[PDB]
Amino acid sequence: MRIIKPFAILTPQTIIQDKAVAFDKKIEAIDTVENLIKKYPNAAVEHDENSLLLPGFANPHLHLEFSANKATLQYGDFIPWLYSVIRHREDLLPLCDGACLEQTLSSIIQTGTTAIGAISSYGEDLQACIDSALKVVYFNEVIGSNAATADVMYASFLERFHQSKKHENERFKAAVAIHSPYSVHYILAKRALDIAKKYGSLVSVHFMESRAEREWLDKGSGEFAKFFKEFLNQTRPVNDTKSFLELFKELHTLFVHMVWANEEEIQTIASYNAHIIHCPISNRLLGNGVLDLEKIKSIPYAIATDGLSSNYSLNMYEELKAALFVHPNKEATTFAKELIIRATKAGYDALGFEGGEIAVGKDADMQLIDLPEGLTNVEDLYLHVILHTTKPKKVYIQGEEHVRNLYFQ
Amino acid sequence: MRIIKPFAILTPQTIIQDKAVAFDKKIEAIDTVENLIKKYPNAAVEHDENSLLLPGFANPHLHLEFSANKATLQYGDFIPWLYSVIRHREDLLPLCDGACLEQTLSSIIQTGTTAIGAISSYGEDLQACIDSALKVVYFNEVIGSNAATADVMYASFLERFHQSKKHENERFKAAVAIHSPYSVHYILAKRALDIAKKYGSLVSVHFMESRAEREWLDKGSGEFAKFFKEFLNQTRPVNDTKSFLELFKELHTLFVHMVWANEEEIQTIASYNAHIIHCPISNRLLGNGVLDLEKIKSIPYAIATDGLSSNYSLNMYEELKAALFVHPNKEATTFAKELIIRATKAGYDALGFEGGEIAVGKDADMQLIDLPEGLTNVEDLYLHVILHTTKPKKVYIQGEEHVRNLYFQ
Ligand SMILES: [Fe+3]
Ligand SMILES: [Fe+3]
Ligand SMILES: [K+]
Ligand SMILES: [K+]
């Protein structure tokens, strides 16, 4: 049992001063140090009066297998980016060996993230995710728009799903991902989602990431048309959007990106057990614009980085700074608070892990970070945490101090 | 004489490969290494094939005297920020002693900036600027809206101007700043600008930084009205905007911020010898929105950080990343190129220093930075320089390698 007394606790929803946190695997109590030592005489008190305690981040959406990318994939424009993934994945995947994956996951923990949603396309990241101290939801992604090869795509997905499922534990959950509404045949999506239903898996899907997708699925025209004709010899979209979206009605689904979603889609998703995953850097760098947060206000959202295939880091502090800037007209002190809540509590809710809040009964998944100097208004704390922090001093996962440095469960 | 052969040179306007740069104080030649050694047999060739050469940045607008600020001033809203400056400047100024100023200027050089525009309100930064290896335009700022005390404000400005002018050299130029159209009486502005005219000084002015300023100077109403009534016992704006703007017609002026400028003002400024200084982080963090670059396309602009009074760093790489994000719908590969040009060449043009370009006859004010790995499309270089760079490996000012580490002229 340990007691930490920081300058303040971000819960994240509230700022608590003059209290400490008692924790072992879970957060056991939040009270004055004097009260806590009466209850927990075996817990040494650690005073960190120049530090803040907040939950570990959840990063519910990243593509680990692409972690070798720095400047190989084409940024600025979504269809050219996609062509570059197809052209270069055979080079990039082998470059990210076990050392690349280990280093990447360690970097994630060292920057204060304690839970992730890993989108896995080939299963090459399985061993790294089961070894990692991070809590991982491991989304086995299926892709394929051609009915002729749907059996093969399903077989691959099924094998990967079962290969991952044998490793489940408190820090590893097997899950299902549908690549998108343009790239997965309806019948293949349905069969993969039947597996999710059978096993009670979380589901993730990229939905309305680009205007090209919007126009292709609405009209069968636009920038995707050349891509589908050239690469796939397809002349029209394989899925009706409404029919595809209906497949998710009985599942807990992460709808990722959502930049180009329309009002009907948003109303439908609001009626589901669903979260939106907002990836501001990835959307901006791939020429996809910015998610309008007011339009999706009926649906909870969380923040993620996407992979290094469309981002220059997996540091959630960097993602949160970018989020402040791509929504530049949102008043900064209040929006920083919203962002910190969405990056902790909301992301943990999206992943279904018990954490993301400094609250009794939650796993002690926590970050200890430097207190920004010269603070005059405690309400400004959330903004200054985003602006001045790059990495925590300590990171706890289930009460275990992993960054003190152990990166493996 | 030295020759450097990098992987590529950003001029900044063009990408040159397969050539090296010969330089002493100035850039002497740009040619193949084979040709350069024929011309400069005394210059050892340095091969840096995993690096890029680009000009040192200009940062034409910063408030050094406020470099102690981290979380003391109020962010999010401009009038509250201004109240906080008034409330806390007596605490913040003394905290930034010579060590604070020395460390700040050293940090500026270490992040690849080689020329600055220092806005000085009290002259407390004079010694640091004359000592610094940086090229500095030292803008002696005047403020005061009350006619009754204009004589005192002018006397202070004049003394500071003359105290700075005695130190002029290739790396230090004395200049004049007018705080703003709301805070400087017309007659005080005119008298300060007469000094600029007499001595041929550059001029800087904050212009249309906030909507409050826009409404106050258009209508005598809005958020500034409470401020002027309470702090200044003034009930209407002291200046007619058009009359105030006319004062700058014969000068070379840096118009800083410009977020809320109107079409008439922009047309007028376009007819002047004038540059706009774009400070995206400061504008965003103080609840002032984002400068519309399309509306000011008739006027050249440069990028600056403003002071640590409204920014979390003075690193131009960070400013450029923020610029990418606050203009999130500008295609990234082309906009990154625009930004690099505006941060080097345009800022040097604004400050009137000979530099900001890797071109024969220019001072060798240069940065050597890491080449981003795995590049497939050389045209993407500008974007990857902004995304992946935090500090250069080497920084040259007039050919002298200051970052290799010497911070003093
Ligand atoms: Fe993704
Ligand atoms: Fe300023
Ligand atoms: K794990
Ligand atoms: K100097």
Side-chain angles (χ1 to χ4, degrees), chain A residues 1-86 88-403 405-406 408-409, chain B residues 1-86 88-403 405-406 408-409:
Chain A
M1 192 72 62
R2 292 172 63 162
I3 293 162
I4 289 173
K5 172 56 182 62
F7 175 82
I9 303 164
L10 302 187
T11 68
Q13 308 94 329
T14 180
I15 302 166
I16 299 175
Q17 300 177 72
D18 302 309
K19 297 192 176 180
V21 177
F23 65 100
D24 181 28
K25 176 181 191 179
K26 293 185 191 292
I27 295 162
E28 296 287 340
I30 300 165
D31 211 328
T32 63
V33 170
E34 289 99 327
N35 288 331
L36 292 182
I37 65 169
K38 287 171 180 190
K39 303 169 173 141
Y40 305 99
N42 63 322
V45 178
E46 175 182 323
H47 289 95
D48 295 312
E49 295 288 358
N50 301 306
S51 304
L52 296 168
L53 205 53
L54 70 156
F57 297 125
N59 180 355
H61 188 82
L62 59 88
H63 298 256
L64 290 169
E65 296 161 306
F66 286 88
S67 295
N69 184 59
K70 192 132 155 286
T72 295
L73 301 178
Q74 180 64 72
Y75 291 167
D77 193 354
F78 187 68
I79 299 304
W81 176 80
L82 191 60
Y83 272 85
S84 77
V85 173
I86 294 162
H88 294 295
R89 63 193 170 186
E90 259 66 66
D91 298 316
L92 287 169
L93 299 167
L95 284 171
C96 193
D97 59 353
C100 165
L101 302 162
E102 185 175 350
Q103 154 75 131
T104 302
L105 293 175
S106 181
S107 286
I108 287 171
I109 294 167
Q110 284 182 220
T111 57
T113 292
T114 52
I116 65 166
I119 305 297
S120 178
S121 302
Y122 306 102
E124 298 190 356
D125 49 358
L126 176 59
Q127 185 67 48
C129 290
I130 66 177
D131 282 344
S132 182
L134 287 164
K135 292 174 176 177
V136 179
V137 179
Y138 188 82
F139 292 99
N140 295 282
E141 191 179 60
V142 70
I143 195 165
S145 61
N146 184 2
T149 54
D151 57 340
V152 178
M153 293 292 94
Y154 178 73
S156 161
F157 154 81
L158 197 61
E159 167 81 4
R160 288 179 287 115
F161 178 81
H162 284 289
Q163 281 176 341
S164 71
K165 186 112 185 125
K166 57 175 155 46
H167 300 288
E168 284 192 321
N169 64 86
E170 286 178 3
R171 305 196 194 177
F172 187 83
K173 304 303 177 167
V176 171
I178 307 302
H179 179 258
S180 78
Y182 56 87
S183 61
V184 185
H185 192 288
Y186 180 83
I187 301 291
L188 177 57
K190 188 166 56 161
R191 296 294 145 88
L193 293 174
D194 277 347
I195 294 297
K197 293 187 178 186
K198 179 171 177 169
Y199 294 94
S201 311
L202 197 51
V203 173
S204 189
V205 58
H206 302 106
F207 198 92
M208 292 296 153
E209 183 175 1
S210 65
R211 197 188 179 116
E213 174 180 352
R214 172 82 284 155
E215 293 177 3
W216 178 241
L217 297 177
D218 284 352
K219 296 180 288 185
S221 64
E223 310 165 297
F224 252 133
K226 169 184 164 77
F227 176 92
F228 274 92
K229 290 181 175 56
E230 294 191 352
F231 258 105
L232 284 156
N233 308 136
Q234 293 170 189
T235 68
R236 49 89 185 180
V238 292
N239 298 323
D240 172 58
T241 314
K242 182 194 178 74
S243 304
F244 179 89
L245 185 55
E246 196 217 321
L247 296 173
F248 296 86
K249 68 190 299 64
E250 306 169 27
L251 287 158
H252 181 187
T253 307
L254 292 59
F255 285 92
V256 184
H257 303 305
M258 293 282 290
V259 179
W260 297 85
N262 69 31
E263 190 174 12
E264 185 168 1
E265 295 158 354
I266 291 165
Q267 292 175 336
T268 299
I269 291 163
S271 77
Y272 294 178
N273 183 8
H275 284 78
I276 290 172
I277 310 303
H278 179 33
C279 297
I281 291 181
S282 173
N283 294 343
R284 187 272 175 271
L285 289 183
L286 299 187
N288 290 325
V290 184
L291 178 64
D292 176 355
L293 299 174
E294 291 297 317
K295 87 169 170 189
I296 61 137
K297 66 178 189 290
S298 55
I299 303 162
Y301 78 91
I303 300 287
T305 59
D306 224 352
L308 293 172
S309 36
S310 58
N311 204 324
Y312 58 93
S313 90
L314 304 178
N315 185 339
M316 286 283 289
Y317 287 101
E318 190 71 6
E319 199 73 30
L320 289 177
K321 283 178 184 67
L324 285 173
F325 290 122
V326 302
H327 305 278
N329 295 133
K330 295 198 65 68
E331 188 282 327
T333 65
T334 60
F335 188 47
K337 177 170 184 178
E338 176 177 329
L339 289 174
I340 289 291
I341 294 167
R342 299 316 187 277
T344 52
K345 183 175 144 23
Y348 262 79
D349 288 345
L351 294 172
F353 286 124
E354 159 183 329
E357 277 193 280
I358 306 306
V360 172
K362 297 278 173 344
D363 277 359
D365 295 2
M366 307 180 305
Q367 307 181 58
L368 190 73
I369 66 172
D370 290 334
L371 173 63
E373 290 135 297
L375 192 71
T376 50
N377 180 357
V378 74
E379 293 185 352
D380 293 349
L381 262 177
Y382 298 93
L383 176 59
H384 288 289
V385 161
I386 296 174
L387 301 182
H388 300 288
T389 311
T390 295
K391 68 175 56 177
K393 295 178 228 234
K394 299 189 172 184
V395 178
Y396 297 87
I397 304 174
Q398 300 196 300
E400 303 197 322
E401 195 184 290
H402 276 282
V403 166
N405 251 52
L406 81 159
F408 298 100
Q409 187 182 21
Chain B
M1 192 72 62
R2 292 172 63 162
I3 293 162
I4 289 173
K5 172 56 182 62
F7 175 82
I9 303 164
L10 302 187
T11 68
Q13 308 94 329
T14 180
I15 302 166
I16 299 175
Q17 300 177 72
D18 302 309
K19 297 192 176 180
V21 177
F23 65 100
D24 181 28
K25 176 181 191 179
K26 293 185 191 292
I27 295 162
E28 296 287 340
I30 300 165
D31 211 328
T32 63
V33 170
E34 289 99 327
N35 288 331
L36 292 182
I37 65 169
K38 287 171 180 190
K39 303 169 173 141
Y40 305 99
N42 63 322
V45 178
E46 175 182 323
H47 289 95
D48 295 312
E49 295 288 358
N50 301 306
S51 304
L52 296 168
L53 205 53
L54 70 156
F57 297 125
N59 180 355
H61 188 82
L62 59 88
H63 298 256
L64 290 169
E65 296 161 306
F66 286 88
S67 295
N69 184 59
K70 192 132 155 286
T72 295
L73 301 178
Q74 180 64 72
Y75 291 167
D77 193 354
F78 187 68
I79 299 304
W81 176 80
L82 191 60
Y83 272 85
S84 77
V85 173
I86 294 162
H88 294 295
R89 63 193 170 186
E90 259 66 66
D91 298 316
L92 287 169
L93 299 167
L95 284 171
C96 193
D97 59 353
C100 165
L101 302 162
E102 185 175 350
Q103 154 75 131
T104 302
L105 293 175
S106 181
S107 286
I108 287 171
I109 294 167
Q110 284 182 220
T111 57
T113 292
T114 52
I116 65 166
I119 305 297
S120 178
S121 302
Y122 306 102
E124 298 190 356
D125 49 358
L126 176 59
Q127 185 67 48
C129 290
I130 66 177
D131 282 344
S132 182
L134 287 164
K135 292 174 176 177
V136 179
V137 179
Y138 188 82
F139 292 99
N140 295 282
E141 191 179 60
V142 70
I143 195 165
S145 61
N146 184 2
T149 54
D151 57 340
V152 178
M153 293 292 94
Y154 178 73
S156 161
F157 154 81
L158 197 61
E159 167 81 4
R160 288 179 287 115
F161 178 81
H162 284 289
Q163 281 176 341
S164 71
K165 186 112 185 125
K166 57 175 155 46
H167 300 288
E168 284 192 321
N169 64 86
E170 286 178 3
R171 305 196 194 177
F172 187 83
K173 304 303 177 167
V176 171
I178 307 302
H179 179 258
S180 78
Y182 56 87
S183 61
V184 185
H185 192 288
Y186 180 83
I187 301 291
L188 177 57
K190 188 166 56 161
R191 296 294 145 88
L193 293 174
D194 277 347
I195 294 297
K197 293 187 178 186
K198 179 171 177 169
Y199 294 94
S201 311
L202 197 51
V203 173
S204 189
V205 58
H206 302 106
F207 198 92
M208 292 296 153
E209 183 175 1
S210 65
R211 197 188 179 116
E213 174 180 352
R214 172 82 284 155
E215 293 177 3
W216 178 241
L217 297 177
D218 284 352
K219 296 180 288 185
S221 64
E223 310 165 297
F224 252 133
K226 169 184 164 77
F227 176 92
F228 274 92
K229 290 181 175 56
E230 294 191 352
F231 258 105
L232 284 156
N233 308 136
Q234 293 170 189
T235 68
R236 49 89 185 180
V238 292
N239 298 323
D240 172 58
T241 314
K242 182 194 178 74
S243 304
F244 179 89
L245 185 55
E246 196 217 321
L247 296 173
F248 296 86
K249 68 190 299 64
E250 306 169 27
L251 287 158
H252 181 187
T253 307
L254 292 59
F255 285 92
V256 184
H257 303 305
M258 293 282 290
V259 179
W260 297 85
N262 69 31
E263 190 174 12
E264 185 168 1
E265 295 158 354
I266 291 165
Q267 292 175 336
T268 299
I269 291 163
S271 77
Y272 294 178
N273 183 8
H275 284 78
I276 290 172
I277 310 303
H278 179 33
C279 297
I281 291 181
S282 173
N283 294 343
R284 187 272 175 271
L285 289 183
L286 299 187
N288 290 325
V290 184
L291 178 64
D292 176 355
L293 299 174
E294 291 297 317
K295 87 169 170 189
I296 61 137
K297 66 178 189 290
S298 55
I299 303 162
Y301 78 91
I303 300 287
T305 59
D306 224 352
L308 293 172
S309 36
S310 58
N311 204 324
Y312 58 93
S313 90
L314 304 178
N315 185 339
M316 286 283 289
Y317 287 101
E318 190 71 6
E319 199 73 30
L320 289 177
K321 283 178 184 67
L324 285 173
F325 290 122
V326 302
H327 305 278
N329 295 133
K330 295 198 65 68
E331 188 282 327
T333 65
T334 60
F335 188 47
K337 177 170 184 178
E338 176 177 329
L339 289 174
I340 289 291
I341 294 167
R342 299 316 187 277
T344 52
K345 183 175 144 23
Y348 262 79
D349 288 345
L351 294 172
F353 286 124
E354 159 183 329
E357 277 193 280
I358 306 306
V360 172
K362 297 278 173 344
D363 277 359
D365 295 2
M366 307 180 305
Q367 307 181 58
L368 190 73
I369 66 172
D370 290 334
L371 173 63
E373 290 135 297
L375 192 71
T376 50
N377 180 357
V378 74
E379 293 185 352
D380 293 349
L381 262 177
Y382 298 93
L383 176 59
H384 288 289
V385 161
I386 296 174
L387 301 182
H388 300 288
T389 311
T390 295
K391 68 175 56 177
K393 295 178 228 234
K394 299 189 172 184
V395 178
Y396 297 87
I397 304 174
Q398 300 196 300
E400 303 197 322
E401 195 184 290
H402 276 282
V403 166
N405 251 52
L406 81 159
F408 298 100
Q409 187 182 21

